[PDB]
Amino acid sequence: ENALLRYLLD
Amino acid sequence: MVPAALPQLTPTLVSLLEVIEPEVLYAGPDSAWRIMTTLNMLGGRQVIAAVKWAKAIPGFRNLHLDDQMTLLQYSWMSLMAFALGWRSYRQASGNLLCFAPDLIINEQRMTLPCMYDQCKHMLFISTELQRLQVSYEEYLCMKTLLLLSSVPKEGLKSQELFDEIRMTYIKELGKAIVKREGNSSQNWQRFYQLTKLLDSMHDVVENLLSYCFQTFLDKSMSIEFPEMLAEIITNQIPKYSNGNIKKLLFHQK
Numbered sequence A: 001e002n003a004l005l006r007y008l009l010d
Numbered sequence B: 001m002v003p004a005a006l007p008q009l010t011p012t013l014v015s016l017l018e019v020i021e022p023e024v025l026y027a028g029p030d031s032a033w034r035i036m037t038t039l040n041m042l043g044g045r046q047v048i049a050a051v052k053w054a055k056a057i058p059g060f061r062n063l064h065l066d067d068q069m070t071l072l073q074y075s076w077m078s079l080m081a082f083a084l085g086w087r088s089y090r091q092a093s094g095n096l097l098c099f100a101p102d103l104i105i106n107e108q109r110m111t112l113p114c115m116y117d118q119c120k121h122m123l124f125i126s127t128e129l130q131r132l133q134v135s136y137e138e139y140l141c142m143k144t145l146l147l148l149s150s151v152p153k154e155g156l157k158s159q160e161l162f163d164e165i166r167m168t169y170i171k172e173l174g175k176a177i178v179k180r181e182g183n184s185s186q187n188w189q190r191f192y193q194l195t196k197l198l199d200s201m202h203d204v205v206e207n208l209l210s211y212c213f214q215t216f217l218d219k220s221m222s223i224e225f226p227e228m229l230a231e232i233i234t235n236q237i238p239k240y241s242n243g244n245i246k247k248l249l250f251h252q253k
């Protein structure tokens, strides 16, 4: 769903 | 002539805000439809920089991951619009929106058909920073507060920590004001004024998101958004439209 935001935040 | 060296960090939140603040992005048109797409493409890059910035803010990464994602989704437009107001205010060259050093929108372009109604809201921030003569330190504190200004109605998973973090930056804004060396009475008045300006950002943002969401959704309008922005907006809308976004206010209103 929020793969990009999640990736950036990890 | 001095040697190469990094400036001295001190044990204060504002000294850290200053070091972690991203550098201004360069963008790298006389039709509103084209201008809009260009602004969005810049915006997506500025938002990626903003996510990296938020992860450096003392306390942020200690919040539950869902909390972090929600705060960013709820506040990105506010952070982007406030920074746009700042760059425009610091240009001191009149009513001009300074999206990037190589992308300025002057009075002539701001009045193109379809542009004024959206540019006027962005310009409002600039004229307010100018009217209050906001200092860089005050601006950094206020900008951090915008990241912590819109929450889910049901509360965050890390609510207690969030409340502590928020109070930390409210005090830091107070320290930035005090530092200007006004008297006690001026300090009280200024805290009132800057918190009123923070509250007024909620209304500004409501005007901007209206354009953001409609232009994003109406695929027939052929206004493009980069991937990152598209994903955020896609997730934000449901929360926004369901009335889940609670605006924290300093003043009753």
Ligand SMILES: C[C@@H]1C[C@H]2[C@@H]3CCC4=CC(=O)C=C[C@]4(C)[C@@]3(F)[C@@H](O)C[C@]2(C)[C@@]1(O)C(=O)CO
Pocket: B036, B037, B039, B040, B041, B042, B043, B044, B046, B077, B080, B081, B084, B099, B100, B118, B122, B208, B209, B211, B212, B213, B215, B216, B223
């Ligand atoms: C009126 C809205 C608010 C506009 C945004 C206001 C905040 C901002 C500041 C910037 O430095 C770069 C992009 C953004 C983040 C923006 F300017 C572009 O995205 C286009 C934007 C969404 C808008 O013009 C659009 O809806 C056009 O599609």
